[PDB]
Symmetry: D3
Subunit: 61 residues, 6 copies
């Protein structure tokens, strides 16, 4: 299983390490996928490249 986590910049390297651990475990225990088969990709987003309702987060409070 390939897991892509897309989130905003701002997380610490420690939070990223924990995210990978926990997400990998969640997948392993709910899909029966072997541990060495679970891959996780982290993709960081910039506020000026992310919008909701036509307004970029960099343009909001």
């Amino acid at each position: 299983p390939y897991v892509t986590v897309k989130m905003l910049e701002g997380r610490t390297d420690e939070q990223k390490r924990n995210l990978v651990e926990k997400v990998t475990e969640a997948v392993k225990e709910t899909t029966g996928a072997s541990e060495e088969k679970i891959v996780v990709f982290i993709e960081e987003m910039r506020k000026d490249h992310y919008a909701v309702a036509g307004k970029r987060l960099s343009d909001m409070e």
Copy 2:
């Protein structure tokens, strides 16, 4: 955050329900993100559309 889980066809509806819940909790507890801001997408693959080492899974023997 946005999480995309890409895995082979086969999981039951129940397993998918658990996958979504566990993965959401993993993200919430590890990044601080609030539940209503955590989106999960599930993408299923066919054994004849996934390959490793030049051999599609549907062609392994």
Copy 3:
């Protein structure tokens, strides 16, 4: 530019035709890109493959 619109199943063929046209015009008028260089991909999701707050849409009540 390449635009991928990911949305739930349900739109009619007509709506998709309009989506492609309007989105292409939006890109052309806003980035300066020429029409023949604007590609649009449509990706449909199933309600049981999309979740928010740990609950797939097919499980909301």
Copy 4:
């Protein structure tokens, strides 16, 4: 609806803001999707990471 716009580096922050506005509007008026449900991601490409006909744009005139 989730819209990912993948385009080359080179656009101004103003063009990006306009792109988001227009694209969000195009989606809203052709799919009946509510405004607060339309998300837009902008992904920028580097010329040396983009190719057509086997030739990267960074290797063209």
Copy 5:
């Protein structure tokens, strides 16, 4: 490395087998990556879900 080939429906099972093999060899010989570390995903598109210049392929005449 992970290679995703996105193309229109239509190729035969044989062509896909060859695509996977050739693409894997191209990656191996050009990046130095070992075969067991080269994954290939095939994604098929529908003519009514792919557009260029504001016209879906299923609408071209």
Copy 6:
């Protein structure tokens, strides 16, 4: 056909140019796709954003 090659940072610009050439050729000769229709995107991954078996590559030897 759209080919996305996702690999770790570390390759030379020459290896990237060769990758594009070879991959484009592999696709052309196995799918019957015209040369000017084959697009290749290179996406580089950071070791601290890539994990296998719950362990990020930046956390391995």
